[PDB]
Design a protein around this ligand. Structure first.
Ligand SMILES: O=c1ccn([C@@H]2O[C@H](COP(=O)(O)OP(=O)(O)O)[C@@H](O)[C@H]2O)c(=O)[nH]1
Ligand SMILES: O=c1ccn([C@@H]2O[C@H](COP(=O)(O)OP(=O)(O)O)[C@@H](O)[C@H]2O)c(=O)[nH]1
Ligand SMILES: [Mn+2]
Ligand SMILES: [Mn+2]
Lengths: 313, 311
């Protein structure tokens, strides 16, 4: 049956105790705490941070990043469970509307097979709170609807999902890194989302909103050699970009593999459709890796090589 | 719907007149002047300066401080307007590129809901920047070209979301960064127009003034239910960080941080303090009196245990 996961910082034993007491009052015994990534203690050299290494600096805020890692890690776990078991993921500061246990039960019973991602709470646009009280607050049907995308102002504090949604989110990140705050990431991912009527949970004490310090990434070893690419350390081809992803070489290499139009990627996280002549590559210093540089597809270079060597120079 | 605000010193009536004539020439008929904080007349004892009272002394330069206060006050106003109305904030020495009114209109029409902070001009640190900033005729909105940025809050479009974020940043940090770079370093997502719509000894009420405000000592009238104040005492080290010598700001930071057990009025918030009998003497520098606030919950825990002991 339903697995409940509560994302909780080890240090927030206050929040943990509150949640445990809430579950007791609801007679819910089937839950577990996920030990949340503490943004404060994330190590600058930890390779898991690769997903955040790009030009959207807001994602490097310690609390923002820790939160993102926590949901993402939970998704990896859920993604692995292809049994189809349902998970309810909660944050550790939520409130239950009265008769939570009964209401959740009714909602669960109503779920159809295609409803893989369901918000049972969300932040509603301030301007839309009044006009959506009928569907979100006052409703007594306990039914599941397409997400009201026009009303959405964030929230992964209460959602029911299975491996299908989790795997999709995980896949999205493998092609994008984490360039969007984690709740908006699900919203922008293109995965179909649903909602309960009414909402079952709702949410000021915050380990995120007042932390503006960013993780300062340590330079980490570049131990990556690939059969299909030549690596040129400390050189780049400015421009000719498809897009920026994130400074994570395995992620980048895979993206480059899958894209016929991609001829090169740099370790800063740019995947490129055009590069300059090699003699026109510019110098780039180590920012993320020892060494940073550019990977170029061998097939591209081999074509050039054959032709250039044939020429009467 | 766009509200235009021009930051202008009351004394710079010359700049004001120029701007008004510029608006006329551009057929912009609605705008208002914000009365800029004159750094020259900021009172040493004015409590508003608490945000500048720290070790980054460059922020205490009279013009720098006045400018910072002006944008910050404008942000407070905008932050209050949660209707989502767009504001265009200008400094009072800018030039409009030809066909400003029409071009602005085109830019406004392209705005997406997440684009809360948009530079329509900035100081650029040349082929690429001329093409995107000067020659471009698309009138579209892009992520800020962070690599090209060399400052500027002389022309920006924002709503309450950007303003409130900046305001919040300052409530947790004071103003330890020149105000333009503050937005840039704040972590808020910033955008830019292609092209830019506006552009800027050189006439300046900031860049020639190196004299700093010398802060007067002001009364410490602050008593808090959750803290005991010990005047003219400090606990050396055990610091999280220095913020600024502003007691209300500090108290709020201390409230919100479970690891914080004390703060001094010099602007240091602390995670560890010595035994009380090992507190050191510190003189009045910002407040009468300077000293240390210690959380009562911390001391009450000690008190219970110490009183239980066979002494
Ligand atoms: O460094 C952090 C801070 C928070 N969180 C988790 O993110 C959720 C929201 O945290 P909080 O309530 O502090 O933030 P807010 O709701 O204000 O964004 C909770 O489940 C936390 O355990 C996390 O994983 N790492
Ligand atoms: O004491 C001062 C000096 C300037 N400013 C404002 O800051 C902006 C930039 O000032 P100025 O052009 O003199 O400075 P610069 O561009 O040389 O830094 C203008 O809107 C001024 O009204 C202010 O608020 N207080
Ligand atoms: Mn929360
Ligand atoms: Mn100027």
């Amino acid at each position: 049956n339903l697995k409940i996961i509560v994302i909780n910082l080890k240090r927030r034993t206050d929040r943990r105790e509150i949640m445990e007491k809430k579950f007791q009052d609801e007679n819910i015994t089937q839950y577990e705490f996920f030990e949340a990534f503490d943004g404060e203690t994330l190590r600058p050299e930890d390779p898991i941070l690769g997903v955040f290494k790009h030009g959207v600096h807001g994602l490097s805020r310690k609390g923002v990043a820790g939160c993102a890692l926590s949901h993402y890690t939970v998704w990896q776990k859920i993604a692995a469970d292809t049994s189809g078991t349902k998970y309810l993921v909660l944050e550790d500061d939520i409130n239950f509307k009265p008769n939570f246990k009964e209401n959740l039960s009714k909602v669960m019973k109503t779920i159809e097979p295609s409803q893989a991602m369901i918000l049972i709470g969300m932040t509603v646009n301030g301007d839309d709170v009044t006009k959506t009280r009928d569907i979100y607050e006052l409703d007594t049907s306990y039914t599941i609807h397409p997400l009201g995308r026009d009303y959405y102002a964030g929230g992964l504090f209460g959602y029911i999902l299975d491996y299908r949604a989790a795997q999709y989110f995980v896949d999205y990140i493998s092609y994008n890194g984490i360039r969007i705050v984690i709740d908006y990431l699900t919203y922008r991912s293109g995965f179909p989302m649903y909602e309960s009527h009414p909402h079952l949970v709702y949410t000021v004490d915050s380990d995120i909103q007042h932390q503006y310090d960013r993780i300062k990434y340590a330079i980490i070893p570049n131990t990556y050699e690939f059969d299909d690419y030549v690596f040129i350390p400390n050189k780049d081809s400015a421009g000719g970009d498809i897009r920026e992803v994130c400074a994570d070489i395995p992620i980048l290499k895979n993206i480059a593999d899958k894209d016929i139009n991609c001829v090169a990627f740099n370790t800063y996280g740019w995947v490129k459709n055009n590069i300059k002549p090699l003699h026109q590559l510019i110098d780039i210093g180590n920012r993320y890796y020892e060494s940073d540089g550019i990977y170029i597809k061998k097939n591209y270079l081999l074509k050039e090589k054959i032709i250039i060597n044939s020429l009467n120079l």
